[PDB]
Amino acid sequence: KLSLQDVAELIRARACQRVVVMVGAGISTPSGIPDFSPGSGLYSNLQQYDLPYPEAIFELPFFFHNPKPFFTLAKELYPGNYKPNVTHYFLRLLHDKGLLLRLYTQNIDGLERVSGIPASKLVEAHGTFASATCTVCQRPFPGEDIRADVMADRVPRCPVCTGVVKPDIVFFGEPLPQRFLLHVVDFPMADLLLILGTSLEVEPFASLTEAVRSSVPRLLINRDLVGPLAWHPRSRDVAQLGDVVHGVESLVELLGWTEEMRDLVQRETGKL
Ligand SMILES: CCCCc1oc2ccccc2c1C(=O)c1cc(I)c(OCCN(CC)CC)c(I)c1
Ligand SMILES: [Zn+2]
Numbered sequence: 001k002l003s004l005q006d007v008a009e010l011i012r013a014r015a016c017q018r019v020v021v022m023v024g025a026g027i028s029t030p031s032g033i034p035d036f037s038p039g040s041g042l043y044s045n046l047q048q049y050d051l052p053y054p055e056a057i058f059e060l061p062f063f064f065h066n067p068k069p070f071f072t073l074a075k076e077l078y079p080g081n082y083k084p085n086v087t088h089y090f091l092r093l094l095h096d097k098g099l100l101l102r103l104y105t106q107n108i109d110g111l112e113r114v115s116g117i118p119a120s121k122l123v124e125a126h127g128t129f130a131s132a133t134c135t136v137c138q139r140p141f142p143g144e145d146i147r148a149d150v151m152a153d154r155v156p157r158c159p160v161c162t163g164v165v166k167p168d169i170v171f172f173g174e175p176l177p178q179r180f181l182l183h184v185v186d187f188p189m190a191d192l193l194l195i196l197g198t199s200l201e202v203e204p205f206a207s208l209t210e211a212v213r214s215s216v217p218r219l220l221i222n223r224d225l226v227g228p229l230a231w232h233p234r235s236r237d238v239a240q241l242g243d244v245v246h247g248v249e250s251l252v253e254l255l256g257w258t259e260e261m262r263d264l265v266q267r268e269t270g271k272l
Helices: 004-012 041-048 054-058 060-065 068-077 086-096 143-151 178-189 244-255 258-271
Strands: 019-023 100-105 122-124 127-134 140-142 165-169 192-196 218-222 237-241
Touching: 004 192, 004 237, 004 244, 019 086, 019 178, 041 068, 054 068, 068 143, 086 100, 086 244, 086 258, 100 178, 122 127, 122 178, 127 143, 140 143, 143 165, 192 244, 218 244, 237 244, 244 258
Parallel strands: 019 100, 019 192, 100 122, 192 218, 218 237
Antiparallel strands: 127 140, 127 165
């Protein structure tokens, strides 16, 4: 049975070169973002100035009745406000070394892109602020195109039809984005599965943990060994439990990437 050190050695040797990564809230709580709660600036602004129940912010009928609470969230989360942490920059290094096949994220914070991972390596399964769509005519827009409006508290409008333009966040009851169907080709192709800051207990992600081939190691860096990896373990599974930040930092040191990480972060926080 494999250790965290064993997985790092596979990566160093390039024996695993087609890494599929699945990430959740656990990697973004350290940047200061909540899992999608009294006491924060955000909550003082929405959950008090005007939401009726927390979930309404992600419901379409509410949205069309009153888009302001949702846009308060967009303004708080739009790229630039929060910083990627070591977990995101680990995945950035993985990509820059040619080892990342795809990163599947449950998060909407956008920090994978802010860390510099290109859109084509990402599957933002719960959607993104990086793009937006007219709710009436379906015209797509880059997220930059509505940024002035979002930062100024204006509800963005389509210049063709004047419909409300909504960031491409997945709302209750909507289908997952089309890119999610990359799983069909990605999972068979993976030669390593890394799962960070979630246990993927909820479908369709749960089932995806079993879509890699039987010889593929699955590394869970998560608070606990729970979920599908716990219910149906495989002989090449590895669990690094406790703090996901320490976990990643540990893996980065075993990889020998600690100094390169320090240089990346210093360049990157220079530019932001
Ligand atoms: C088909 C999967 C939908 C994914 C999804 O769309 C959302 C829209 C707004 C807010 C959240 C989501 C969201 C999820 O994050 C999500 C979806 C489901 I369905 C979901 O199910 C709850 C699981 N449930 C049964 C075990 C409680 C244990 C959970 I938790 C999160
Ligand atoms: Zn339109």
